[PDB]
Amino acid sequence: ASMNPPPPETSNPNKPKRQTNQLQYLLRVVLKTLWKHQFAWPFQQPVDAVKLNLPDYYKIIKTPMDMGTIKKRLENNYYWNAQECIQDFNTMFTNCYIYNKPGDDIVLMAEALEKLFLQKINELPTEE
């Protein structure tokens, strides 16, 4: 195979929606802070394995995830639980570590973003 898969779903009108202080925090503080990090750009959209000429990317990574998708999910109220969003961030980081090798610059970039992510998640507000 060579083609990219369709990108992850970001909206589903059939799913119930709610606003919570934790979901708001995840968009306003966590996602936004990570987005503006200098090393954020490789994580701001789905991996285009065609453009990058990486035909094995989607043979190795079967649960792709990226911050562009996460951001849109938050904006579309796709997540009911903060934990769903946190899981998507963790999937993004682990995919990077699984596909690439320890010494790669892209892994260094991911590790920097992850450190910041954990700092912000450690400050997650108690549910209101």
């Binding site: 490789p42 959209q45 990058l52 690439n100 790669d104």
Partner: peptide
């Protein structure tokens, strides 16, 4: 690698 220089 190219993954850290283009998207």
């Amino acid at each position: 690698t190219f993954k850290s220089i283009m998207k």
